[PDB]
């Protein structure tokens, strides 16, 4: 069975005071035995958050670059993320792709490097509103997934995150059936293009205005293996989402 | 009376162990009179480095974004940098412009936001080799400086860093005359387009393969007020650079 996975993406929010308070609340929460919980603090607070968080919660970086060290002012490497005690990185997030112009090619190189260095990868994919309305969701997500898959060095350390761009931060949550429909196809894509084992074992998580009010019906879909949560990860309802099953 | 300014840009280098060792070396440096030393660790280590560094060395972030909080996965704000005890940010670095595609317009918005929030800015400008060889160095650097200047909310908190792209990481250090020629022009640009006071008070530092072997002759040029140092900031030679006017 795939272990239920809940990530909280704090994005560019927080200071030591308010994040420290949130962390205290999370450390007091009961993480089910069948759930893996990950928090992704702003980059300046990776180390702080790992120090403050109970080990039952993992830490993720929000991004990384594609070499171990080098002349890349403003970047961090998987080796740094590991050195700070974090065990995952979020790659290909919508904001990186669409605000900061990260290409699929660049995301694939980051995936290859992070996995080669033994860091877990939450690899994000998803279509824009205009693509959804044109009926080409599948084409877009399959193309993104192929680039990720072609660079996966260790499938045991990947989580795929389907996050339709029109659902991020907009309050426009995907319906359960909408999410299940895409997750099912993605899983079929993995079966046909990689292996049965990889299709069976890879967590495909949904993100997009996931909230306490929407999480249970989404989590009950058989191909929805958890969530990546943005706005609600900073809120007490993040605990309800952790317990969505 | 401009204070000599030496910044060290660690770029994407270091782990807690080797940066702890580098920090020990920096903490043992006697900072001369009237000299300001700033170090810019990788973003994951801003807090670590500020905790470990003696207050005689300031910490900078290597980059930031242009709002206080928001939905910008992978970014950090001036408020976070201040919260970690850092007092500067490097903006418009060549690597950000030319590897990561940051436009002048974006850099100007970052400069405005950081300064509005009381964070010091090391604002980088510089021409590429093909621009220099085309004879357009001045046009390029003046255009970059104008975008910075148009967004400066507090000149007391800005340092301008002239870093010709062909000199960064290449070993191809500008000659003293090459640097002084551009710095003199930039200073003239400030005089003509801002004020005499701003021209007189603004540090214009040089970067581009600054090393212990080149730093004194560069620092002696009258419009070269210090350095932004990449590769040599990771070595004990950085201390020789701090003492370039000694």
Swiss-Prot record, chain A:
The gene is TPI1. Substrate binds at residues 9, 11. The modification N6-succinyllysine is found at residues 146, 153, 191. Belongs to the triosephosphate isomerase family. It holds the Pfam family TIM. CDD domains: TIM. Keywords: Acetylation, Cytoplasm, Gluconeogenesis, Glycolysis, Isomerase, Isopeptide bond, Lyase, Methylation, Nitration, Phosphoprotein, Ubl conjugation. GO terms for cellular component: cytosol. Homodimer. The modification Deamidated asparagine is found at residues 13, 69. The lineage of its organism: Eukaryota, Metazoa, Chordata, Craniata, Vertebrata. It catalyses: D-glyceraldehyde 3-phosphate = dihydroxyacetone phosphate; dihydroxyacetone phosphate = methylglyoxal + phosphate. The modification Phosphoserine is found at residues 77, 103, 156, 195, 209, 220. The active site is at 93 (electrophile), 163 (proton acceptor). SUPFAM superfamilies: Triosephosphate isomerase (TIM) (SSF51351). It comes from the Eukaryota. It comes from Oryctolagus cuniculus (Rabbit). This is Triosephosphate isomerase. The modification N6-acetyllysine is found at residues 11, 153, 191, 235. InterPro entries: Aldolase_TIM, TIM_sf, TrioseP_Isoase_bac/euk, Triosephosphate_isomerase, Triosephosphate_isomerase_AS. The modification 3'-nitrotyrosine is found at residues 65, 206.
């Amino acid at each position: 069975s795939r272990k239920f996975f809940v990530g909280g993406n704090w994005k560019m929010n927080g200071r030591k005071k308010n994040l420290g308070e949130l962390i205290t609340t999370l450390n007091a929460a009961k993480v089910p035995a069948d759930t893996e919980v990950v928090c992704a603090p702003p980059t300046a607070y990776i180390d702080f958050a790992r120090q403050k968080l109970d080990p039952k919660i993992a830490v993720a970086a929000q991004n990384c670059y594609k070499v171990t060290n080098g002349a890349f002012t403003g970047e961090i490497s998987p080796g740094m993320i590991k050195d700070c005690g974090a065990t995952w990185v979020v790659l290909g997030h919508s904001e990186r792709r669409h605000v900061f112009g990260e290409s699929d090619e660049l995301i694939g190189q980051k995936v290859a490097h992070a996995l080669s260095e033994g860091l877990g990868v939450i690899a994000c994919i998803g279509e824009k509103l205009d693509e959804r309305e044109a009926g080409i969701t599948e084409k877009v997500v399959f193309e993104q997934t192929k680039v990720i898959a072609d660079n996966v060095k260790d499938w045991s350390k990947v989580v795929l995150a389907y996050e339709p761009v029109w659902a991020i931060g907009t309050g426009k949550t995907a319906t359960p059936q909408q999410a299940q429909e895409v997750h099912e196809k993605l899983r079929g894509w993995l079966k046909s293009n990689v292996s049965d084992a990889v299709a069976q074992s890879t967590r495909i998580i949904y993100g997009g205005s996931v909230t306490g009010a929407t999480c249970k019906e989404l989590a009950s879909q058989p191909d929805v293996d958890g969530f990546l949560v943005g706005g609600a990860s900073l809120k007490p309802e993040f605990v309800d989402i952790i317990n969505a099953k």
